[PDB]
Design a protein around this ligand. Sequence first.
Ligand SMILES: [Cl-]
Ligand SMILES: [Mg+2]
Ligand SMILES: [Mg+2]
Length: 304
Amino acid sequence: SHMAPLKDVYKNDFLIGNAISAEDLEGTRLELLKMHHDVVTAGNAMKPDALQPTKGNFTFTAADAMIDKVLAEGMKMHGHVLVWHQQSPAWLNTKKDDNNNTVPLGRDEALDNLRTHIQTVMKHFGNKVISWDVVNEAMNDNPSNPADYKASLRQTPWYQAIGSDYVEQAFLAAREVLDENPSWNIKLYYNDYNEDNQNKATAIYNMVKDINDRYAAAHNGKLLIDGVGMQGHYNINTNPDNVKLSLEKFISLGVEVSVSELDVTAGNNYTLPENLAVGQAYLYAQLFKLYKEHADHIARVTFW
Ligand SMILES: [Cl-]
Ligand SMILES: [Mg+2]
Ligand SMILES: [Mg+2]
């Protein structure tokens, strides 16, 4: 419940977003969506399982209905998500062996599927989105050696098929689509959660800095990764000082930052309903005060 239209309050600071399903585009839900938000994210409709459920059967119909309705209603669209370990069909990066066990594909076949998916889906929606999450949730939680970002990457199905360079290869494939369609203004994001954990933030920073420093040196200073998304699945024991330290660390890469899936839930420990509501309201207030203070480098704040 918002007591003043949020997109109006924050119009000079950052886009205000919400994640939606098709139900949100009808009735009182659509009026609330429009009044408070400038930008939407599809909760599920643009994920790899929703867009390419089997090899070469691209299924864009429902996604196109959603994004055309969002634009007709005067809102923008953030694309979520080209490459993820969850909600991603097995055929992209595994096969069945002769005894019907699931095993990884080889690197070349898996790259080919990775590039084809990214490049087909990006070209289908074109500039109907303002941004894409190119890769989501690639980094382990609480990595013990964050100075070595490649050792800190989750051993997901893409990592097991392609190797530690697959995040870089995903962004190179998406950047080639934009190079070939120069009039599209679309920001390429890396998105992850638990970025208030300082080790995980250091690992993410080291990954983006390596990828972007090598790309910029070869491309007249142009960055590869334009944005870091902080998912913001926080709880009432999240320390807003740790959110500020990571926010500032990502700003120091020269990228924009967005908050992509913000929600505040109870902690580990048993809370009790009034104490829970006070904790949630106080964190939200502290986070928006921090975001306003850094608005020159925050493009969007989207709720879950
Ligand atoms: Cl986060
Ligand atoms: Mg801003
Ligand atoms: Mg063009």
